[PDB]
Design an enzyme around this catalytic site. Structure first.
Site, PDB file in Angstrom:
ATOM      1  N   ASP A 289       0.811  -1.198   0.000  1.00  0.00           N
ATOM      2  CA  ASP A 289       0.000   0.000   0.000  1.00  0.00           C
ATOM      3  C   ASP A 289       0.850   1.255   0.000  1.00  0.00           C
ATOM      4  OD1 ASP A 289      -2.295   1.629  -0.154  1.00  0.00           O
ATOM      5  OD2 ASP A 289      -3.404   0.378   1.294  1.00  0.00           O
ATOM      6  N   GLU A 495     -11.201   6.262   3.901  1.00  0.00           N
ATOM      7  CA  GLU A 495     -10.124   5.826   4.849  1.00  0.00           C
ATOM      8  C   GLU A 495     -10.327   6.444   6.233  1.00  0.00           C
ATOM      9  OE1 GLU A 495      -6.133   5.473   3.015  1.00  0.00           O
ATOM     10  OE2 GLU A 495      -7.115   5.638   1.100  1.00  0.00           O
TER      11      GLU A 495
HETATM   12  O1  LIG Z   1      -2.576   6.955   1.441  1.00  0.00           O
HETATM   13  C1  LIG Z   1      -2.855   8.358   1.451  1.00  0.00           C
HETATM   14  C2  LIG Z   1      -2.857   8.858   0.010  1.00  0.00           C
HETATM   15  O2  LIG Z   1      -3.770   8.061  -0.775  1.00  0.00           O
HETATM   16  C3  LIG Z   1      -3.702   8.455  -2.148  1.00  0.00           C
HETATM   17  O3  LIG Z   1      -4.719   7.724  -2.861  1.00  0.00           O
HETATM   18  C4  LIG Z   1      -4.026   9.930  -2.333  1.00  0.00           C
HETATM   19  O4  LIG Z   1      -3.760  10.364  -3.670  1.00  0.00           O
HETATM   20  C5  LIG Z   1      -3.197  10.833  -1.406  1.00  0.00           C
HETATM   21  O5  LIG Z   1      -3.773  12.125  -1.411  1.00  0.00           O
HETATM   22  C6  LIG Z   1      -3.319  10.288   0.011  1.00  0.00           C
HETATM   23  O6  LIG Z   1      -2.436  10.986   0.894  1.00  0.00           O
HETATM   24  O1  LIG Z   2      -4.309   5.266  -4.074  1.00  0.00           O
HETATM   25  C1  LIG Z   2      -3.459   4.146  -3.729  1.00  0.00           C
HETATM   26  C2  LIG Z   2      -3.911   3.443  -2.440  1.00  0.00           C
HETATM   27  O2  LIG Z   2      -4.112   4.485  -1.504  1.00  0.00           O
HETATM   28  C3  LIG Z   2      -4.218   3.898  -0.185  1.00  0.00           C
HETATM   29  O3  LIG Z   2      -4.436   4.998   0.658  1.00  0.00           O
HETATM   30  C4  LIG Z   2      -5.396   2.915  -0.135  1.00  0.00           C
HETATM   31  O4  LIG Z   2      -5.313   2.241   1.129  1.00  0.00           O
HETATM   32  C5  LIG Z   2      -5.368   1.887  -1.271  1.00  0.00           C
HETATM   33  O5  LIG Z   2      -6.636   1.227  -1.317  1.00  0.00           O
HETATM   34  C6  LIG Z   2      -5.216   2.609  -2.610  1.00  0.00           C
HETATM   35  O6  LIG Z   2      -5.050   1.641  -3.646  1.00  0.00           O
END
Ligand SMILES: OC[C@H]1O[C@@H](O)[C@H](O)[C@@H](O)[C@@H]1O
Ligand SMILES: OC[C@H]1O[C@@H](O)[C@H](O)[C@@H](O)[C@@H]1O
Ligand SMILES: *[C@@H]1O[C@H](CO)[C@@H](O)[C@H](O)[C@H]1NC(C)=O
Ligand SMILES: *[C@@H]1O[C@H](CO)[C@@H](O)[C@H](O)[C@H]1NC(C)=O
Ligand SMILES: *[C@@H]1O[C@H](CO)[C@@H](O)[C@H](O)[C@H]1NC(C)=O
Length: 606
Positions: A289, A495
């Protein structure tokens, strides 16, 4: 096999494994570690991609070439990056990944399908497969070859900010919906060996079962936290759908930020190597991740050397860095030079990344197809999203007393009707998180139809529609309305922002429902990612529908409200009476739900 400058790995007629071995045998350590590195487009440039032999790029949520970008702009961006990668000594194409988790949702004008919890409510795996098929087309419309979906989390506590990304609290429903995978990637052949990766070709995308494993099991639904459960429970609840994913040839698996019995998943060799690779025979690639390895330590990022060591030794193949690629590559190179990580581990990682790239046809079609641009937002796919939204709706109440006339279906012809509420005319709210922006957004953020627009499109021409976002009681009583449709609920989140210990909708929602329903008979449409405190909304309303996060096609909602189709959705989760009950799951001793899993009233088409 012929010309004097022949190179076996470039020969499309050769077996994938032969091509993988031929290429691997030619690669320097720099070229190998490059394949293992995925970077954000925000930090990519042609020189960075060539000089570091980068294997993959992604857009995170909201990472777009510009606001409102056309499908052609996305293809030109992805091709610009690909041209740099193809100009390296070995010309290994990069794979570009994105979260297309309910349609190609970062892209303006893409069809936005209901989120997973609503799809669970349909109990229709074939619908979900068709959604995977349409999603692949719209992702390829933008030149992208890889979607980070499905999320096969089994959400066991709705206080989790990602509960809407889980099809169900019941692993059986989640297993059924792994049909998304052959929709996105294509059906596997007759011969197929479980655990092998598969993508059919240039009109399909690599998929990603995520987040391995027990992401939906965390204490109090705290995102990224600890899942405290014995191996039997982990294997009975959180694991099963990973096996169905192997059976369907999922190309990649993304590891979870969460821990299991206190061990970070990103450092768990027993599960990533011992179980996923060595027991389930997964032969695709395992990806981290986002800053997942950083978060192995407390505080996050406090020993990046250890993060690299622990994750690579656990068995991860590709790291979603996604920004500090020079540090990542430098540290990993140091570990290999020092003998701390063996070459066998690097070669395994690169074998799996190359296996997916060759299998999916990426060396044969590294560049976008301009004829696919027009697939974005196609009416056929909007019609599918409208079917899905309608099938996802769960009718919870249809009359205040068992002897009242059923409110739904409503008539399309009436002199004057009211549409109200903060969610009645807000496309962003009806899509939720992972739509245009990472956390979603408010208002008209893309192309679609709000509930208000859908009502205006459905009713007889003689029916006057009045919209008031938050009318007071006197406005409603004095308005000469035949009925009201009032839509309220959660605001978009993703999230940790979505973790919520109270599960009460924002005001003015309940106050608006009470004002409207107190003045005229009302159908309440509740937009949420999960069950929320609902007794007060129920008490006020003649009819109440749980519409979840239905996406861009608001006509799915009015298709059932006006009786073009009957309600058929059933709860894919338990509806609690109180958050104090939580966690509370079908099977538990204190199982005392407001509405049990599988509950849903029906109507007949009029
Ligand atoms: O894991 C956190 C990150 O996820 C990504 O999908 C987003 O583009 C970022 O803005 C975010 O900080
Ligand atoms: O955007 C890339 C990644 O961002 C992370 O914050 C999330 O947990 C993932 O599900 C997602 O694929
Ligand atoms: C769970 O959350 C608590 C409180 O924020 C945190 O301090 C702890 O480190 C987390 N545990 C895990 C395994 O992430
Ligand atoms: C309910 O929780 C959410 C998110 O954590 C918060 O924004 C809202 O204000 C909360 N209400 C409380 C804690 O009383
Ligand atoms: C819907 O259809 C079936 C008849 O096939 C019936 O059993 C059910 O009660 C019907 N409900 C209404 C309200 O018509």
């Amino acid at each position: 096999h012929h010309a004097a400058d022949y190179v076996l790995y470039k020969d499309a007629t050769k077996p994938v494994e032969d091509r993988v071995a031929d290429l691997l045998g030619r690669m320097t350590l720099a070229e190998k570690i490059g394949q293992m590195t995925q970077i954000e487009r925000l930090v990519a440039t042609p020189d960075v991609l060539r000089d570091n032999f980068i294997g993959s790029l992604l857009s995170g949520g909201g990472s777009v070439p510009r606001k409102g970008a056309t499908a052609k702009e996305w293809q030109d961006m992805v091709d610009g990056f690909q041209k740099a990668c193809m100009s390296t000594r070995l010309g290994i194409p990069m794979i570009y990944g994105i979260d297309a988790v309910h349609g190609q949702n970062n892209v303006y004008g893409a069809t936005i399908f209901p989120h997973n919890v609503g799809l669970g409510a349909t109990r229709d795996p074939y619908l979900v497969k068709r959604i995977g098929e349409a999603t692949a087309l719209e992702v390829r419309a933008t030149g992208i070859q890889y979607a980070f979906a499905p999320c096969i989390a089994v959400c066991r506590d709705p206080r989790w900010g990602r509960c809407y990304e889980s099809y169900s609290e019941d692993r059986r429903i989640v297993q059924s919906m792994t049909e998304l995978i052959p929709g996105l990637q294509g059906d596997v052949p007759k011969d197929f060996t479980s655990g092998m990766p598969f993508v059919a070709g240039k009109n399909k995308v690599a998929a990603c079962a995520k987040h391995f494993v027990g992401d939906g099991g965390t204490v109090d639904g705290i995102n990224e936290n600890n899942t405290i459960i014995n191996r039997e429970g982990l294997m009975n609840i959180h694991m099963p759908a990973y096996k169905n994913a192997m059976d369907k040839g999922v190309s990649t698996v993304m590891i979870s930020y969460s821990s299991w019995n206190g061990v970070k998943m990103h450092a768990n060799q027993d599960l990533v190597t011992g179980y996923l690779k060595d027991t389930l025979k997964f032969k695709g690639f395992v990806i981290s991740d986002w800053e997942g390895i950083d978060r192995i330590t407390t505080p996050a990022g406090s020993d990046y050397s250890y993060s690299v060591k622990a994750s690579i030794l656990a068995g991860l193949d590709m790291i979603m860095v996604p920004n500090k690629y020079q540090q990542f590559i430098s540290i990993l190179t140091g570990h290999v030079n020092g003998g701390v990580i063996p070459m066998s581990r690097i070669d395994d990682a690169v074998t799996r990344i190359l296996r997916v790239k060759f299998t999916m046809g990426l060396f044969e079609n590294p560049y976008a197809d301009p004829a696919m641009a027009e697939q974005l937002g196609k009416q056929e796919h909007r019609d599918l999203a409208r079917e899905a939204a309608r099938k996802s709706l769960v009718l919870l109440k249809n009359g205040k007393t068992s002897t009242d006339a059923p409110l739904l279906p409503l008539p399309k012809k009436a002199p004057k009707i009211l549409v109200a509420g903060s969610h009645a005319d807000n496309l962003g709210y009806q899509c939720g998180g992972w739509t245009i922006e990472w956390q979603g957004d408010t208002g008209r953020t893309t192309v679609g139809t709000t509930i208000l627009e859908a009502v205006k499109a459905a009713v007889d021409p003689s029916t006057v529609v009045v919209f008031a976002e938050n009318p007071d009681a006197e406005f409603v009583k004095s308005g000469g309305f035949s009925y009201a449709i009032v839509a309220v609920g959660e605001h978009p989140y993703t999230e940790t922002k979505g973790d919520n210990l109270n599960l009460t909708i924002p005001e003015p929602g309940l106050s608006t429902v009470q004002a409207v329903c107190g003045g005229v008979r009302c159908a309440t449409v509740l937009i949420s990612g999960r069950p929320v405190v609902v007794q007060p909304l129920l008490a006020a309303s003649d009819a109440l529908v749980a519409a979840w996060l239905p996406g861009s096609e608001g006509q799915g909602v009015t298709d059932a409200l006006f009786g073009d189709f009957g309600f058929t959705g059933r709860l894919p989760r338990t509806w609690f009476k109180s958050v104090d009950q939580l966690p509370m799951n079908v099977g538990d001793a204190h199982y005392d739900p407001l509405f049990r899993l599988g509950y849903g009233l029906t109507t007949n088409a009029t």
